[PDB]
Design a binder for this molecule. Structure first.
Ligand SMILES: CC(C)CCC[C@@H](C)[C@H]1CC[C@H]2[C@@H]3CC=C4C[C@@H](O)CC[C@]4(C)[C@H]3CC[C@]12C
Ligand SMILES: CSc1ccc2c(c1)[C@@H](N1CCN(C)CC1)Cc1ccccc1S2
Ligand SMILES: CCCCCCCC/C=C/CCCCCCCC(=O)O
Length: 378
């Protein structure tokens, strides 16, 4: 028991890293313009929930710890610490889960030429996240004042409250989160195979068109280039600020190939010289922007997979032991599994710390903001 005084300190480390880790994330997304992605707009709100969870309900989880788990505050405010903790936590899965199916639908749909709002779509999307988040949390204060106390410690004790609340707030979202996620990674991976194929196709026939000695050999070789070029025009990862240029440079590049074709049938010696995408800056940019754009979404999917994965890995101990309380009400000792719950809620409460760490470990631009922000300099 000499080493059990460390829990206070170790848990305070989990309280510190979450309040600081997500304070920067709120800062760094707002200040540095290079991180204004729609998916970085979600991350800025999520990180607020983790800031609000660290700032409100993780500490009194420790305050209770010090007292021996006998609830140390007024009787009357227990449903509000359960409510708050339920609400912010339930907003962190909703933020994660929204992100995954927001990115999922966009990859399996086209541009769709909507852009009704000017990247307030994030702002609309996030307020829907919280009202669904606070949709679910009204039942705790609705039956706020019993079903919230057990032997002088404060836990959700209504069996259906803690049974329904697992599927509605944890397993449905975690499953939804993961099911969409994997479909997308398989989808993105299977769309990079199309752009690379379309540029390889385009370059090989370009060499063929130049090196072909027959008169109409160009025809098959430069009609195919038109074919791939359109497919590329139809392909971009989810990511009108740079969408004209892609379309214009698609159109602008197509002109060069199109024109050579137009005068290819007419003819001959000159059209080989006419299809010279090798000599023009336009074509070189487009291969660049796509391969840089393809690779960026690779790393976003991986960084997101890390936060997705270790969110549900970390809270599953607390939810499996808790759902097992009600399923195993009679068979198994409740003083052991109640002990596991004192612990497995800090495996879970520690995810609020983790995701700022994984941002620095894999996003160069998130790293530089934090490092400066520690030094105070914008
Ligand atoms: C109770 C004691 C130990 C402090 C608890 C941790 C928090 C509240 C402390 C510790 C380190 C502090 C931060 C140090 C660095 C920055 C970045 C700066 O650009 C804005 C202020 C800010 C964000 C400070 C605000 C408060 C802070 C986050
Ligand atoms: C009791 S059954 C249940 C159902 C829903 C939710 C919780 C618990 C919540 N706990 C946290 C501990 N706190 C002492 C009580 C409330 C935990 C959590 C974790 C992750 C996302 C959402 C939620 S909301
Ligand atoms: C996705 C990763 C999943 C990891 C699962 C870890 C499981 C943690 C605990 C499981 C429930 C244990 C409950 C122990 C109660 C013992 C019952 C008794 O005393 O009779």
């Amino acid at each position: 028991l000499q080493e059990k005084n460390w829990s206070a300190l170790l848990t305070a480390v989990v309280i510190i890293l979450t309040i600081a880790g997500n304070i920067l994330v709120i800062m760094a997304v707002s200040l540095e313009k290079k991180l204004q992605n729609a998916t970085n707009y979600f991350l800025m709100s999520l990180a607020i929930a983790d800031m609000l969870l660290g700032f409100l309900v993780m500490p009194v989880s420790m305050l209770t710890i010090l007292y021996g788990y006998r609830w140390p505050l007024p009787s009357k405010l227990c449903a509000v610490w359960i409510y708050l903790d339920v609400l912010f936590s339930t907003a962190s899965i909703m933020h994660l889960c929204a992100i995954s199916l927001d990115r999922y639908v966009a990859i399996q749909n086209p541009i769709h030429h909507s852009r009704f709002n000017s990247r307030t779509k994030a702002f609309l999307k996030i307020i829907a996240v919280w009202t669904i988040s606070v949709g679910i949390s009204m039942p705790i204060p609705v039956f706020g004042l019993s079903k919230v106390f057990k032997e002088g410690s404060c836990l959700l004790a209504d069996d259906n409250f803690v049974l329904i609340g697992s599927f509605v707030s944890f397993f449905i979202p975690a499953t939804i989160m993961v099911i969409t996620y994997f479909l997308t990674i398989k989808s993105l991976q299977k769309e990079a195979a199309d752009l690379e194929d379309n540029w390889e196709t385009l370059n090989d026939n370009l060499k063929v068109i130049e090196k072909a000695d027959n008169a109409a050999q160009v025809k098959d070789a430069l009609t195919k280039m038109r074919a791939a070029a359109l497919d590329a025009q139809k392909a971009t990862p989810p990511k009108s600020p740079d969408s004209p240029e892609m379309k214009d440079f698609r159109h602008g590049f197509d002109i060069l190939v199109g024109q050579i074709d137009d005068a290819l049938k007419l003819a001959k010696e000159a059209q080989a010289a006419a299809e010279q995408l090798k000599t023009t800056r336009n074509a070189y940019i487009q291969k660049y922007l796509t391969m840089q754009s393809i690779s960026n979404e690779q790393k976003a999917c991986k960084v997101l997979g890390i936060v997705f994965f270790l969110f549900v890995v970390m809270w599953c101990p607390f939810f499996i032991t808790n759902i097992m309380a009600v399923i195993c009400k009679e068979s198994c000792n409740e003083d052991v599994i109640g002990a596991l719950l004192n612990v497995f809620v800090w495996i879970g409460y520690a995810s609020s710390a983790v995701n700022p760490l994984v941002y620095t470990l894999f996003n160069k631009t998130y790293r530089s903001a934090f490092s400066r922000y520690i030094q105070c300099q914008y």
